C-alpha cells in the first residue's frame, strides 16, 4: 500500500502536512499544549475544536528519495510559525516519545533514522512508534487535554492535508 | 537541488529520471542499457526517463524505457545506508545522441577539494517542498573524510563521502537520490542522504562509486 494526502497525492519526503482526524465529530488537527507542570507547550495533543487544523508537520527521512512509504523510518517535527516566546529561537521542533508515560513530546534541545512510521489503517492511516511498532493514539487526561501517546491496539486514524499549494 | 542553478538543455545528458507515475529518484546512464542509482530507490516496475530537462514537457529526444532488472548491491543495509547503490537494466538499448549520452565510471577515487557537478529535479527548499520544472545543478567540493565524520559521527562508512558546504545554503535534497556526482568527467558519487537539506555542518552524503566499479562491471557482464 501507499501513503496519500487528502488530494490523493502520494506523501512527499520533507513535505509539510496538517494531520487531521480521519473521522470527524471529535477533535481537530495535531498541535502543541502544556500539560501538568511544564511552563512551555511541549506536548503533542489533538485540538479540542473540530474547526481547527492546528500546527503543520514536516515528515521526512534522511535518504533523499522524493516520496514516503510505510517502510521508511520517519522523522516528524512541527513547523515553527508563530510560536510562543518559549520555543521562539529553536530551529526544529522534532517529536520524541518520552517518559514512562510514552507521550509524544517535542524535543527542541536535541541516531541515523527516526522512530516513527506511517501505516495504512482501514480507509485512512495511523502513526506508529518503532523502538517493536506500537500505534499512537489519544489518551484524554483529567483536564480533557487530548494527548498523543503510545497506545497499542487503539490508534488515532489520521489523514494528511498539504499545508501549502 | 538547493542553492543551485538551471543546468540547461543537453549539458547533463547522462542524467536520468526514475518514475512510477511520479518522479521519485534520479540516476546515471553508464552505457546504452545500464543506469546507476541508489539502492533505497528500489521498487518493482521502474520507468526510466532519458533526455529529460523540463518535466512538464515531452521533449523529442526524450526516451521512456522500463527497467527489466533492478539489481541492488548484495550488501546494501537499509539501516546504515552502507552500499547504497543499485543497477538498473533497461528493457531495450537507449538511443545515444547529444541529449542522451553516457558518463564514465572512474578509474580511481576523487580527492577532497575536487569540484563536482551534482544534478537533480529534487526539492529546492530547505523547509517545506518546491520542485523545479527544469533540471537543477550545483557545483560542490568533495570534503575530507575527517570533516565528513565530524558532521556525521559514527554514521560515515568507508563507502560514503561528503560534498557540499559546511556553512549551508547549497546542497542536494529530497528527490535527488540516485542522481550523479560527477568530478572531472567521472561518476564519483551517488546522491544518498543527509540530515535535512543545506543545513549548517550537515553536508550531503554520497555513495562512493569508485569502490564499486568491479561490482558494476561484473554485474553488467553477468546480466
Author numbering:
A (entry chain A): 1 to 110, 114 to 134, 141 to 174
B (entry chain B): 16 to 34, 37 to 67, 69 to 125, 127 to 130, 132 to 183, 184A, 184 to 187, 188A, ...
Sentences from the paper on this structure:
The plant protease inhibitor EcTI from Enterobobium contortisiliquum is a classical trypsin inhibitor belonging to the Kunitz family. A Kunitz-type inhibitor that was first isolated from Enterolobium contortisiliquum was named EcTI. It was shown that EcTI inhibits trypsin, chymotrypsin, plasma kallikrein, plasmin, human neutrophil elastase, and Factor XIIa in the stoichiometric ratio 1∶1, but not thrombin, bovine pancreatic elastase, or Factor Xa. The fold of EcTI is a β-trefoil, typical for the STI-related family of Kunitz inhibitors. As found in most known Kunitz-type inhibitors, EcTI has a single reactive site located on loop L5, between β-strands 4 and 5.
Only a single EcTI-trypsin complex is present in the asymmetric unit of its crystals. Crystal structure of the EcTI-trypsin complex reveals the binding mode of this inhibitor to trypsin, demonstrating the conserved conformation of the reactive loop of the inhibitor docked in the active site of the enzyme. EcTI belongs to the family of substrate-like inhibitors characterized by the presence of a reactive site loop in canonical conformation. Its reactive site adopts a classical noncovalent “lock and key” inhibitory mechanism. The side chain of the P1 residue Arg64 acts exactly like a key inserting into the active site of trypsin. The side chain of the P1 residue, Arg64, is involved in charge-charge interactions with Asp189 in the S1 pocket of trypsin. That highly conserved interaction defines the primary specificity for the recognition of the trypsin-like serine proteases by Kunitz type inhibitors. The whole contact area is 987 Å2 as calculated with the program PISA. Superposition of the structures of the complexed and free EcTI reveals that there is no significant conformational change of the reactive loop upon binding to trypsin. Structural differences are primarily limited to the main chain in the vicinity of the P1 residue Arg64 which occupies the S1 pocket of trypsin. Although the fragment 111–113 of this loop in EcTI is disordered, the conformation of the loop for the residues 114–115 is sufficiently similar between the bound and unbound state of the inhibitor to provide confidence for using this fragment for modeling purposes.
